Amino acid sequence: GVQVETISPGDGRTFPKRGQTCVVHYTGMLEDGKKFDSSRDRNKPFKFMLGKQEVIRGWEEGVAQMSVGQRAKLTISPDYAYGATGHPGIIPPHATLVFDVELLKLE
Template sequence: MAVIMPFISLYEERTMQPEIKIEELIEGNGKTAERGALITAHYRGWLEDGTEFDSSYKRGEPFQVVLSNKRVIQGWILGLKDMKVGGKRKLWVPAALAYGERQIGTMIPANSNLIFEIELLDVLTRDD
């Protein structure tokens, strides 16, 4: 049995997928966010120890970005899916769905799990 256990735990470790945790703070009632849409949002981002590394509120203007792999972390694409304008969510994003092994500037160390609070202000799609 001792020989099989390491194999099982190694197999489980390889197949486990990192998961994002989503808390719906305010449910919106406007247009729904989707991959490829141009979104406008206010947000704050923290490390797990509570250190704030970014805030559109502090910059005084909302953040606009296309929800695509080339523009935002995977955690945002997954965490904002089906969110409606007017809504507010809190996301707990594991490092694998954020920046992984890369350090970002001086504020985000490598392998950091991140927390975001995002308020969705607008969504524009190709249909608009």
Template sequence: MATSLGRAITGLCLLAATAANAQSGTKPAVPSTPSAPVTGFDTTAHPASQITRSGVRFVFQERGTGTQPKTGSRVAVRYTGFLPDGHIFDATVTSGGPLRFRVGRREVIAGWDELLLLVPAGSRVRAWIPAELAYGAAGVRDPDDDTRYLIPPNAALVFDLEVVSVR
């Protein structure tokens, strides 16, 4: 039950945050990396990292040779999401399978929509998503305890992503 709830919350939060960012019309700020020094999350440890127009940093851990997504492509993605302090806030391994959505349709956070257009099927990447392209100032509250956050406001996030399929 908790696994299904967590997956549903994450999906809804990804959608809601993206919609909120789109409605506010705010432009992303200067790229940011996780604020707490956590081994393996520092982009300076990855000299091969790339950066998108809006400030998403990423590095290929394995470059796939499959189909390159386009806006509207249906993708299946396995992921683990980390807070700036290194704690995992969500992972598809606990929710029963890859997350499926259409790229570029605001079904996920803006950082994913931009990044996944650059990542062919079969690829694994580590990505640093600025807060403005994730959940922004709203963060994500814990549905079981309104005084806590699952994702704090203004948190830059780190994701390990694997693009399982593109169609």
């Protein structure tokens, strides 16, 4: 499913709310280390509304555990990931993912 293996934690007083928007910087990967996307390729972060289904369910179940200013190393199994259908052009069917999401600020 979804796993969390913290790399370098920090403060944990503040947690994301039910319907607020987070800002993250992430560096996608695959199982063997090849990279296919980044939020540092372009110089602008990612934003998404927690609780609604516009991000894959792995993020929506995992990112809520971390707090302000922590890095991690997620692991999205094929269930919560793009699944057997996958995506055309990048992710083959039945493909594990390994992100590097590091929450930055909370709005």
